[PDB]
Amino acid sequence: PAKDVQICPIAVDTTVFRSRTWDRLKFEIEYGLQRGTTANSYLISADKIALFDPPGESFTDNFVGTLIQRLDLNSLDYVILGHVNANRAHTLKLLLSLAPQATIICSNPAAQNLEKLLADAEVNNPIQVMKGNDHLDLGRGHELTFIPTPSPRYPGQLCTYDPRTEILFTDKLFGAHVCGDQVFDEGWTIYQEDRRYYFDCLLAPAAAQVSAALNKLEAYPAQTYAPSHGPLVRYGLRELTRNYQQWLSEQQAQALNVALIYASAYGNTSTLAQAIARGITKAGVAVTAINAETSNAEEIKEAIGKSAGFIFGSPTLGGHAPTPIQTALGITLANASKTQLCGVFGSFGWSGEAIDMLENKFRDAGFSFGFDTIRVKFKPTDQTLKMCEEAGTDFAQALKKAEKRR
Numbered sequence: 481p482a483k484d485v486q487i488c489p490i491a492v493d494t495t496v497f498r499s500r501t502w503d504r505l506k507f508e509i510e511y512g513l514q515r516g517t518t519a520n521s522y523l524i525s526a527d528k529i530a531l532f533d534p535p536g537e538s539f540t541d542n543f544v545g546t547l548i549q550r551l552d553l554n555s556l557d558y559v560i561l562g563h564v565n566a567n568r569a570h571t572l573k574l575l576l577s578l579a580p581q582a583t584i585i586c587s588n589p590a591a592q593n594l595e596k597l598l599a600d601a602e603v604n605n606p607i608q609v610m611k612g613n614d615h616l617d618l619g620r621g622h623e624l625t626f627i628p629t630p631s632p633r634y635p636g637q638l639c640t641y642d643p644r645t646e647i648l649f650t651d652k653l654f655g656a657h658v659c660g661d662q663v664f665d666e667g668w669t670i671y672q673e674d675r676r677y678y679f680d681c682l683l684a685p686a687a688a689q690v691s692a693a694l695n696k697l698e699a700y701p702a703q704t705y706a707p708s709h710g711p712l713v714r715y716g717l718r719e720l721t722r723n724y725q726q727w728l729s730e731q732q733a734q735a736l737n738v739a740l741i742y743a744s745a746y747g748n749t750s751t752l753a754q755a756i757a758r759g760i761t762k763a764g765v766a767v768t769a770i771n772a773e774t775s776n777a778e779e780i781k782e783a784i785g786k787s788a789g790f791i792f793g794s795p796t797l798g799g800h801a802p803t804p805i806q807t808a809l810g811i812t813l814a815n816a817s818k819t820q821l822c823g824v825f826g827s828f829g830w831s832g833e834a835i836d837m838l839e840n841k842f843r844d845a846g847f848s849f850g851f852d853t854i855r856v857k858f859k860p861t862d863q864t865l866k867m868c869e870e871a872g873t874d875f876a877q878a879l880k881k882a883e884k885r886r
């Protein structure tokens with residue numbers, strides 16, 4: 481059917497707004513099963529009123545249109561963001577126009593992101609940054625506790641626990657890209673493949689950070705996960721959590737590892753990066769994703785120190801690689817053994833000099849390449865993703881073949 485908004489009360493003072501699409505809307509590897517998805521927003525309306533995670537650009541108008549019929553936006557006290565990017569920021573611009581009195585609640589990395597993203601926008605709602613174990617009291621027992629859960633792809637990711645309802649708002653964790661009529665997740669098997677595919681595409685390349693996240697979240701006795709995507713997790717909560725632990729364990733246990741350094745979390749190059757990573761991990765080789773923009777030097781050193789191969793992904797900005805790609809390049813060259821397998825990819829408009837620069841520097845530095853350098857002009861398509869995935873697989877096979885020779 482057409483996109484819609486499914487509304488359901490889910491706990492005291494708490495409502496979910498599921499923006500639903502039955503069709504795939506973006507060419508990103510995680511929508512590969514083409515089972516649709518949902519973008520979930522949550523409203524806690526107590527003494528104070530908080531809205532979690534307005535949906536992105538595809539959903540902006542249905543969502544705001546629907547919300548306004550259920551709520552005077554002038555009474556909105558808080559907008560809580562589990563993660564931030566330009567797509568979500570688009571909806572925020574409109575929502576905050578209608579709710580100028582609201583305060584933005586988010587993590588420190590998200591705040592930094594949002595300040596750039598809304599730099600030229602008129603909206604100037606205040607931002608209140610939340611750190612681990614900070615609280616926000618909505619009244620009526622809804623004293624929220626916040627838990628930062630950063631990953632390369634979601635540097636500003638922030639989970640929230642509501643002790644009144646025992647709901648953990650988990651953002652990108654524990655979800656599934658599947659559109660259905662069920663607001664809750666009764667039935668294990670129908671969601672198993674979606675949940676595993678979701679983990680594999682989104683979380684496997686961040687196995688250590690995701691494990692660190694789940695360790696923190698253990699401290700909260702939640703009976704429901706309220707994720708960004710798919711049904712709420714109530715009936716499958718324990719089983720899915722045990723599965724995540726096992727999957728995380730097997731990722732970090734794999735013999736070979738690839739350091740996958742890409743320029744930033746969101747954008748065409750990032751889309752390519754997730755596709756390549758999935759090709760590697762499905763082939764039984766671990767991936768440590770590195771967001772050059774938000775990563776520090778020790779992260780990059782440690783990744784390169786334990787990897788069998790590394791891959792750079794970069795856009796071209798004014799004829800050059802982004803500064804974070806240039807500095808990551810220096811750290812990589814200063815630390816990588818020439819036995820490491822190398823790879824280069826990227827997207828570009830009409831100039832792709834960043835890709836040429838990287839290919840040349842790695843070739844001059846004596847590295848062998850694990851796939852032919854990937855150059856994608858303008859927006860990735862379905863076959864783009866499959867090609868990148870296949871390149872990742874090729875890279876993985878090359879690593880396994882060379883390792884078997886010891």
Ligand SMILES: [Cl-]
Pocket residue numbers: 562563564565590633634635636637
């Ligand atoms: Cl984020």
